[PDB]
Homo-oligomer: A and B are copies of this chain.
Amino acid sequence: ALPLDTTWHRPGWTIGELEAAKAGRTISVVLPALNEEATIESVIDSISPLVDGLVDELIVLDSGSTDDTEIRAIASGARVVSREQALPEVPVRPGKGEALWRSLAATSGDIVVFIDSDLINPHPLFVPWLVGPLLTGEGIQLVKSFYRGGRVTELVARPLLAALRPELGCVLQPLSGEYAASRELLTSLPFAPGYGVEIGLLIDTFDRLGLDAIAQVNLGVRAHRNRPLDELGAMSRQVIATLLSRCGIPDSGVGLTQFYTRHTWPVSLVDRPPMKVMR
């Protein structure tokens, strides 16, 4: 009923069937983490039984955590890669997008899966449900997830998409941190800084390959640490900055100011280049 390949109910494929359809292709799973000690262990544990089987590689991309994120991740048997270790030749910039970009240099899988580490009790079939359309179907190179309340999603991302890219209006969770894509697509696209990375990869994939290369899959219900409104303001600002860039609209580059005292949050207009150029 939608111009977008959409799996509404729990996918039929089994872990056995999916591993067969791989056909020589490898699968890397990346968990981006910045101070996520309370939830990181549950996330890793839900994925690690797939290692050496369906999943060939599982790493945690530590974005400079100061809490017990690393030591707990190690204690769960996961390989922990810092931003520095992922790409030592290049100095580190702040932001989520930076970590996700660098993670491409720390993995070698033909298919890369991204899962947020702030998930509260994630289902162990998340990764299989994501690589589904990539392994079975053809033409698909990007699989987004949807669930369930996403204030930035429902008030900023989706209304802005409706205004400037109405073709992507059928995407339920454009800012979803849970998605999978081929290395071919990811290393060919630029990576938006900060929280712009999700909405940036979506629009850029659409512009390059059209809706036919994009699929979305239901993962049920999601629970995560709900953030204070001020953090969401900065997050929203970066989403707007990235989205405007992809639509040929000049952004002021001026960070969002909040007041009763004044503080200004950083915003970045600088994308990282496609990972291919770092060959």
**Which A residues contact B (CB, under 8 angstroms)?**
1, 8, 149, 151-152, 154-156, 158-160, 162-166, 169-170, 172, 229-230, 232-233, 236-237, 240-241, 244, 249, 251-252, 254-260, 262, 267
A155 touches B158 (CB 8 A): no
B237 touches A162 (CB 8 A): yes
B155 touches A260 (CB 8 A): no
B232 touches A155 (CB 8 A): yes
Enumerate chain B residues within 8 angstroms of A1, measured Cβ to Cβ. 262
State which of B163, B169, B236, B256 has its C-beta within 8 Å of the C-beta of A244: B163
B237 touches A169 (CB 8 A): no
Q: Complex: how many Å from CA A236 to CA B236?
A: 13
Which residue of B is nearest A252, CB measured?
B166
- The distance from the CB of A13 to the nearest CB of chain B, in whole angstroms, is 21
Enumerate chain B residues within 8 angstroms of A160, measured Cβ to Cβ. 240
Copy total for this chain: 2
B233 touches A154 (CB 8 A): yes
Enumerate chain B residues within 8 angstroms of A236, measured Cβ to Cβ. 154-156, 159
Enumerate chain B residues within 8 angstroms of A241, measured Cβ to Cβ. 163
Q: Complex: how many Å from CA A152 to CA B259?
A: 16
Query: Can you pick out 9 interface pairs between chain A and chain B where the beta carbons lie within 8 Å of each other?
Result: A151-B155, A152-B155, A154-B232, A154-B233, A155-B233, A162-B254, A162-B257, A163-B254, A164-B252
Q: Complex: how many Å from CA A170 to CA B254?
A: 12
Q: A151-B229, A159-B240, A162-B255 are in contact. List 15 more A-B contacts (CB 8 A).
A: A149-B229, A151-B151, A154-B233, A155-B156, A155-B233, A159-B256, A162-B237, A162-B254, A163-B240, A163-B252, A164-B251, A169-B256, A170-B257, A172-B259, A249-B249
Enumerate chain B residues within 8 angstroms of A165, measured Cβ to Cβ. 252
Enumerate chain B residues within 8 angstroms of A240, measured Cβ to Cβ. 159-160, 163
Which residue of B is nearest A234, CB measured?
B159
Enumerate chain B residues within 8 angstroms of A229, measured Cβ to Cβ. 149, 151, 154-155
Which residue of B is nearest A218, CB measured?
B260
- The distance from the CB of A242 to the nearest CB of chain B, in whole angstroms, is 11
Which residue of B is nearest A170, CB measured?
B257
Q: Complex: how many Å from CA A185 to CA B259?
A: 28
- The distance from the CB of A137 to the nearest CB of chain B, in whole angstroms, is 21
